[PDB]
Symmetry: C4
Subunit: 395 residues, 4 copies
Amino acid sequence: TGYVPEDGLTAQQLFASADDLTYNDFLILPGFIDFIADEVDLTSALTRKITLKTPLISSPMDTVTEADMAIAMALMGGIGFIHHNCTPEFQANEVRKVKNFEQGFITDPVVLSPGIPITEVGIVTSRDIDPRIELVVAPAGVTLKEANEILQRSKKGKLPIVNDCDELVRTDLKKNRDYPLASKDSQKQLLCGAAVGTREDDKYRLDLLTQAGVDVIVLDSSQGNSVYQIAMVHYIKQKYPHLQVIGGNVVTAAQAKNLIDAGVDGLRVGMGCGSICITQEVMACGRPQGTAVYKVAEYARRFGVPIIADGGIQTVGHVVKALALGASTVMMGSLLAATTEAPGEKGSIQKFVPYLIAGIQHGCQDIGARSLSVLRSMMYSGELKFEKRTMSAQI
Amino acid sequence: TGYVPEDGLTAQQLFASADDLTYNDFLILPGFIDFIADEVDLTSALTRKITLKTPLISSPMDTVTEADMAIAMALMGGIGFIHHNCTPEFQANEVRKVKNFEQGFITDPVVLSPGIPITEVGIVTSRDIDPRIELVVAPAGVTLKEANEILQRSKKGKLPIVNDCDELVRTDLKKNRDYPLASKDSQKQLLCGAAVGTREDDKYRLDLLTQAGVDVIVLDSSQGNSVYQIAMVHYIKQKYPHLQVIGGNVVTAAQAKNLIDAGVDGLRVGMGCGSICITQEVMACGRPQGTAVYKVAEYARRFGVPIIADGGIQTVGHVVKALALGASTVMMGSLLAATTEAPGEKGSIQKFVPYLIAGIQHGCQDIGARSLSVLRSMMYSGELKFEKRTMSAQI
Amino acid sequence: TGYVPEDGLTAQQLFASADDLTYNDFLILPGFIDFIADEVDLTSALTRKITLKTPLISSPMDTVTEADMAIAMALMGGIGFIHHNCTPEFQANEVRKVKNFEQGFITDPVVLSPGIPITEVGIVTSRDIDPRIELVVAPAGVTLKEANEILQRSKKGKLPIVNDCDELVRTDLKKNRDYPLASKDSQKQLLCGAAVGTREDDKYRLDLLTQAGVDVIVLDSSQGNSVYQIAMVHYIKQKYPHLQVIGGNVVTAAQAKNLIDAGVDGLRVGMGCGSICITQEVMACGRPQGTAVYKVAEYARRFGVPIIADGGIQTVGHVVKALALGASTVMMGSLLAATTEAPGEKGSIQKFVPYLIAGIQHGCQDIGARSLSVLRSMMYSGELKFEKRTMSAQI
Amino acid sequence: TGYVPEDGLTAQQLFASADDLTYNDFLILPGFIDFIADEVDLTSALTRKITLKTPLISSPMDTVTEADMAIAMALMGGIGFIHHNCTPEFQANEVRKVKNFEQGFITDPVVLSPGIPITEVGIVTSRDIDPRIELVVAPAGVTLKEANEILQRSKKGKLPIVNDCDELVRTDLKKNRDYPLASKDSQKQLLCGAAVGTREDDKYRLDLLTQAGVDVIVLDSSQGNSVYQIAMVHYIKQKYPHLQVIGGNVVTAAQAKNLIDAGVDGLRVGMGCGSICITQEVMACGRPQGTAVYKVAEYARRFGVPIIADGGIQTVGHVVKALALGASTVMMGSLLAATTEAPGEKGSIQKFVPYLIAGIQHGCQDIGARSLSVLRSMMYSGELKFEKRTMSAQI
């Protein structure tokens, strides 16, 4: 399957040359195809205990991931991490929105205020204002079929729901979408992630996120191999047994070692690649992303610790290379920054992610792998071949 | 002939370094000249049984090759492949035009319609319309000398020809061109190629092209090493014994092996180079063109299977490198996209191809080869020397 | 601390490849963090006997360093070298201004002229001119507390000071700044440097600078390994025992050897990098800065001779690389050319240098070093790891 | 002198890597200086029997060298080659102008025509036209002192000279320049070169140039290793024993071998570098200039055959590298294309060449060589050290 004469280079040869590699520094050599692209399985491990249908995860940047993005990202098979450039209460509240989502229901109903509902029974509709009104309600439990029917009868849009005197939640929907890849937890709620620092002060924020029901926590740092992060990992692993923890950014196996001994459930890899902020400029330390993912993933798989290729992704090709090199998932920031669901006053994630999924599936087919797992497997075993490009692209 | 002191690198050394090469990554070292450029023979094998006077072939792109291009390409020593971005009937009809061509005859005579001819005997000329007319005809067999004479007598442009009550075809010509390099089949008809997919649905299209008298068929694919293409090759080789088949794009010897065992008569090489379409974006798989041609040609010649260097050609220099590296012919798309004969509302192929021929001939002379065959031979034997350039061109 | 599996390359491996390196050609791999950035010590040796709190030194260019820059540079922990593109008297006078500085005192009081003071006792204020006046004075010794109080009483700005009939010097200040890193000599005066050529004619200029109390002298040259500079070093070392001498620019250990045997107290490294002048264009000789600093520093430390990385600095990252490679201090020109204190009709050095200090401190923390000395130590011992980038940056 | 610790690379190491080098691909490492730049001797061999004070030669391009350029080039220590993009008579006439030059004398006096002179005795001055006049003359032999004195007396500009009834030639000059480096032949005439093809037809042109007194002839070709050029070299060497011949462009030692066995007195090196013409586009053959000069010069010096580094020169640095690598002289085209003396409707060569001379002299001083000969010698012996740059310049 690999070759007859002289093919290209194995990953152990390529990443052993003398130069650190970038995603654009090489190409993967194609193989044998005996299946259709839609047969390729993209199931990926996000952490030791969390598995997703796709390997896509949105970055915890204030220009990328909030409730909007996380929900969309989760419905299409991935997951989003809520940025922490806000107050602990604000961030915790975004998580809450993600965990309470369910199509057909209004995310946040403006209940009373002294159309909106009364009795934090009545309603303050735009007509009785252009003073409350006796509104009609439906019994808790009603389905979207038993609701979008009751609504069509009385010619309405919203359907205030009641059962014990409080307002639990229904809206327009006459061709609802289906989400077969949706990332959900054991209770059928969408999965959500959130970023946090590693200072004592962050312990209060961690507490709110955990009460809000966050599933994964990523310790946001440009250099995660520190006594501070390690102690924070120990703490969480101790006080929140049901919370998965992804460890601060690292780019070498030596850094990975300390965080793994500490008990991280996953590693975020990258430094020097990806977007930049004035509050965090790049200095002398870093590492080409291709090499980083490979060298860290090679050591991490020894302990069953998944790796997230964070930064530098600009195309599907980049994604498939990151995965082929050992990463279990890929984190994207700027490539998603231009979607509808990204915070701020390329279309919707509902069209884009499916586009990336198809692309990755075609990437796998060209190399002859029926899944991303077979892929990493072909590379570790020396079957997968690559080819280095000269520093003057002409492909 | 090679050198006295220390020359450059042999092809087996150059393409064994550690990086895949592009046409712009190296230069060929000159040799000894004892002949004129016009003495260089460019005869090239397109497939196992088809030989052309020049190694030039036009690409099956809708912005490059249709009847127009194929005819021109064939008259100057090469061949064109009709794209398949159209209906099976349309494509089959383009082939037909190419196979029925003969200078001095109108390609497609608008016979009747109820100047054009009547009796799908008469004529509907622009005068009897500004209502048919009794037109004069000539006996089948008449030459262009016995026709362009009969025409000059009666002061006319077209000469309706008859023999058995139907209209077989003559037009203005008083200094007709001669085509000594013309690519023709055993019956003296111009050679024509056509592209097709590899799905069951394509079997109907293959049938029309074959009935239209196509000589070569290329299985259009970004990655030809698949059970689908292999089965399609087996099928054709079985049902159309007289049809030559060029196998889907490959870039490694391992891919070449499967298609050759299947029975292809030629291989189209390239992936990642050349033009791009939204319907086929480049992902993680591909290979620098220089290396691709060399590695595949080195394995293919073992079985007498010609190789077509497809993609990345921008100059004569590129063409000569592709050939020196082992390719038997070169496929060009965008470089021909700007010629008169290219579909759509740099001049004519009749001026351009002769320009490329002279260029290739001078390329051969500078290295001291009297033919493209001697060339590939000097490279395989280690006589031909090359020189690698640093990734910061300064030549 | 270095790594568990396969890290990157040691400095002895990286700078032993086959190519000379630039600061942008590689990255430093991060390590283990168990301290805060503000704990990092940046103490650096400028020469054998001069030590500064920061490793920053301004370049002797007429668009960069004069009295202004040198004072500012010295108050923030570094030092400046006064350019020599002026007369010996002018340059000597700039040094004098630097050595006589003390906050709260007017650098240069325009004493008389026949508000300014009289008696090279009285005053020519803008009122008695819009003719001298009997002005009030204060006893020598008075503090800024006993002065800025006497001033607030009589509602004035300047406070002419007297003791022996001459005017010694006070001005507005009600929130004076403190400078804990200030570079001062044994007498508590700010340290100052100055550039000079190596021709006999320069002996007169050296004499004025020394009488003006200069602490360090740098022999300005594009290629310092010459009998002229060597003889000039011998001369100074002989006639001015208390003057430190930095030797002309060199880029190889062989050049360094001659100047060290001659007795230089420090070496200025660089050639081909940094700004350019028509009066000194770059020819065929030079050396990539990264390699230059490393190779010269490796030989110089054997004799306790500090090295100044001169040229090519554009960012903090560049500074930290220069230091990690063996340089004791770094010389900056164009990066400071845009500050307020730079000669000519990015803000003040008082904001910028502190910005660089913090940056270097963070650079050290990321690699796990509590000081620049530990840093160079980790690199010489093989603990510090680097990673080479391909000539097509993608980080 | 070379180094103490680990310097850079010797030329035999650098040009033995695996890549062909360009002038911008490396730098020369500086050495020890114990002399002034004005002490550097630039004497260079143009061919086996022609020596010049400078190693500069102008290219035989129609936009660069004609009578004008050749004279100027010769007066400043170099030589020019007259292009052949003209008729044999025209080219021969340009040579004649160069050979007959002597300051103080009018190059081409418009003698009669039926101010100009009469008697192909009289004069047709602008006054007797705004009809000839009896003009006064001077005896042959008169000096510029005995002429520019006779002229100042009669208040005139031109001084018709006579001796045997014909007009031999004097003009304004009251501060004539001196040319200590002037390239002159055994008869004190300025040296001149001229280009010619290698076809039989060129034999007539060679004859005119030789009768015109040309000193050197260069066989203009993009690839000189041919039976045609070889036979032309044999012919000239046979029929014009006193004419020096420079052989067609080559870039390998193997090509050099044939032309040397044939008897060339010098080799013009280059292919792929330098200016381009539509009538001669670059194809697949060529070689980076740095490597070309080194590899050909290394073989040529074995037989005492000088080498001309032709093409790619853009700066003094390029010139000094070409010479250090083994070339005896350097040919410049476009760098001189913008001077006053270049044909067509940066100033004069009289200011520019002296500028290049000083630059080369400084180049030599920085490496510690008192002459270009010592230079090539330091490189062949392994003393001269170089340093390769990564394909992403940062110096």
